């Protein structure tokens, strides 16, 4: 039925047919004093969306509404709200929808790494409800995770930042991506793109590192000071020896990426940071010997503090990311999905046209 | 014969009988304009010494004089010397005996990571000679790697710093080991000890992390604010969850050290740094998933700049390391070796009594 009691959205019915989501009606999460209800109007299709649906993460309780690069308007503030959000205000939600907010890690701004962390969708809250939202009309989120969206940034062009962009940003900021640093982006995909842009925006000689050359042109349109085609190198680590300060590996899987060569290209003290989460059956594997004065680590999402920093940056220096809009709906999602697997996206798919798909 | 033309020392004759070195006479490295000849009077027995001799590193050209925690006196400066060393001066030499000194990494103070790096022993120079020195009367080293040894630091108590100590120091300094930081030392062995001391000396709440409790008493005598016995924990990473900033793993091998638990105990941004080099057939193996906001890397020796920093620190705050002297000679080395394998050392063995073992 109408808003209040029931939410509607394009939802997965079975991992078996994850490519065919059907519009569905479901009960929202119980509303809490700090929660906020946001009427959605745009949602970036995140690679994670695809892996989840396909069940690459495991068997998830269905039905299931995916999507977590949300940009909608505030349509109802809970009793104890104090974040300073007004009703009808333009807001965003990313991958995190809950945290404890009391631990050291939260107070210290590392909510993605909280003991009691909960993700936007597919995860049951401490009370049982399995997080939904995304490819739907409304999403119910705790105010700490809802953010203001700068005026100049358009919805379809902001949403992707709530997750993908943030994901690249966090490690880039945290590891000094800035003036005079040499940064490599491994995998000019959805997240790969924003990182390439975000990276430059920060003033770092950005190198884009892909396999073929299919994307050389784009990487360069994006402002990448350099591009590297692995298949055309034999030993790129050898050629680019001692050049990088930081390399953020953001690629769907971690198979076609030899991790015994990469270190060579890192400066003493260099850092390789992966943004990936592949089909569980996968593991990041590399020869130990090589981590000689070069560290390797993994990163998850970012802290809302940073999510804000990014939005601001994307806003202040007019960062135009590459998005191709699709119409929300059993179809749009389908295409969206279909294509994302084929890798047939000009980097980011932002679902829109929410207004004319759910009605009243 | 006498000094000039031939050097003498206790040398390995075959990996097969690496425990029975025999006093030997061998031709020094050709003398070069910056080289320096140091008459040895003390040399710390380094774990590396043991692995090399045993052939854990591979088949090495024999005879072979091991030892690279050298402390002797300057007995001959080469033509172009300018380091400012005087003759008869007290000096030290560690594991590095050569570098290019022109590359970025050298000028930038990372000579251990130089393209043309050469180690004190077992390595042929760009000209062919296989680096010796250590358990001998004289060692011939390029001035860049010979260092002044503070007055107050006794020889047998300084030598171990030239390698072991430096090895722990480097990563500790480089990763902020200091006031208000929580640091863990994994493996209270030779290097483990100095690190425990050095660490405290710098003002870091030092935790010592070993297997049994056999060393609890010592670790505490050393000033360790805490001690942890793995075998008595079941899940120490769980108990010490989110506590460490840095952990330096300095243990002979890397087998009895589960690396899927350690990350848990690291703070977001924490760092695990190994100092180990095990019997080649070995590899540092751990579940990928865990490097969540925690990085893992490896480190080699230190930069002479740091080697100096350490000597200074050990000197200014009177750091007494744990050394048990032995008499250089077919015997002393034997015992030294024998014991080091059994692990029967109160941390560091410093060979001495060089004066009365080689004569004229
Ligand atoms: Zn995501
Ligand atoms: Zn928390
Ligand atoms: Zn050594
Ligand atoms: Zn060099």
From Swiss-Prot, chains A, B:
pH-related activity note: Optimum pH is 7 for the reduction reaction and 10 for the oxidation reaction.
Pfam families reported in the protein's UniProt record: ADH_N, ADH_zinc_N
Keyword Cytoplasm appears in the UniProt entry: yes
PROSITE patterns referenced in this protein's UniProt entry, alphabetically: ADH_ZINC
The enzyme's E.C. designation: 1.1.1.2, 1.6.-.-
Gene Ontology terms describing biological process: alcohol metabolic process; aldehyde metabolic process; furaldehyde metabolic process
Keywords from the UniProt entry: Cytoplasm, Metal-binding, NADP, Nucleus, Oxidoreductase, Phosphoprotein, Zinc
Cofactor: Zn(2+)
Primary subcellular site in the record, as a coarse category: cytoplasm
Phosphoserine PTM positions: 131, 359
GO terms under cellular component: cytoplasm; nucleus
Class in the EC hierarchy, top level: oxidoreductase
Cofactor binding, per record: Binds 2 Zn(2+) ions per subunit.
Subunit structure and binding partners: Homodimer.
Misc: Present with 21700 molecules/cell in log phase SD medium.
Family (UniProt): Belongs to the zinc-containing alcohol dehydrogenase family.
Protein's recorded name: NADP-dependent alcohol dehydrogenase 6
Species of provenance: Saccharomyces cerevisiae (strain ATCC 204508 / S288c) (Baker's yeast)
Gene field: ADH6
């Amino acid at each position: 039925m109408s808003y209040p009691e029931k939410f509607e959205g394009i939802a997965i019915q079975s991992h078996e047919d994850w490519k065919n989501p059907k519009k569905t009606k479901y009960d929202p999460k119980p509303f809490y004093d700090h929660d906020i209800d946001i009427k959605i109007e745009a949602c970036g299709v995140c690679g994670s969306d695809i892996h989840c649906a396909a069940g690459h993460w495991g068997n998830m309780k269905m039905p299931l509404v995916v999507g977590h690069e949300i940009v909608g308007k505030v349509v109802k503030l809970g009793p104890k709200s104090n974040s300073g959000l007004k009703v009808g205000q333009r807001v965003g939600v990313g991958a995190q929808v809950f945290s404890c907010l009391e631990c050291d890690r939260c107070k210290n701004d590392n909510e993605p790494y909280c003991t009691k962390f909960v993700t936007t969708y597919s995860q049951p809250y401490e009370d049982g409800y399995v997080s939904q939202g995304g490819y739907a009309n409304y999403v119910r989120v705790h105010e700490h995770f809802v953010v203001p969206i700068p005026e100049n940034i358009p919805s379809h062009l902001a949403a992707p930042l709530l997750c993908g962009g943030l994901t690249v940003y966090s490690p880039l900021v945290r590891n000094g991506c800035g003036p005079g640093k040499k940064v490599g982006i491994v995998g000019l995909g959805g997240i790969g793109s924003m990182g390439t842009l975000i990276s430059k925006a920060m003033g770092a000689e950005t190198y884009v590192i892909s396999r073929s050359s299919r994307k050389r042109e784009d990487a360069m349109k994006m402002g990448a000071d350099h591009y590297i085609a692995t298949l055309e190198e034999g030993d790129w680590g050898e050629k680019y020896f001692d050049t990088f300060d930081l390399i953020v590996v953001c690629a769907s899987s971690l198979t076609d990426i030899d991790f015994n060569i990469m270190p060579k290209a890192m400066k003493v003290g260099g850092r390789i940071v992966s943004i990936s989460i592949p089909e569980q059956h996968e593991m990041l594997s590399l020869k130990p010997y090589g981590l000689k004065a070069v560290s390797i680590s993994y990163s998850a999402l970012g802290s809302i503090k940073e999510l804000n920093q990014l939005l601001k940056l994307v806003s202040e220096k007019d960062i135009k990311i590459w998005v191709e809009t699709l119409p929300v709906g059993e179809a749009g999602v389908h295409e969206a999905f279909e294509r994302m697997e084929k890798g047939d996206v000009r980097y980011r798919f932002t679902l829109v046209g929410y207004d004319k798909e759910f009605s009243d």
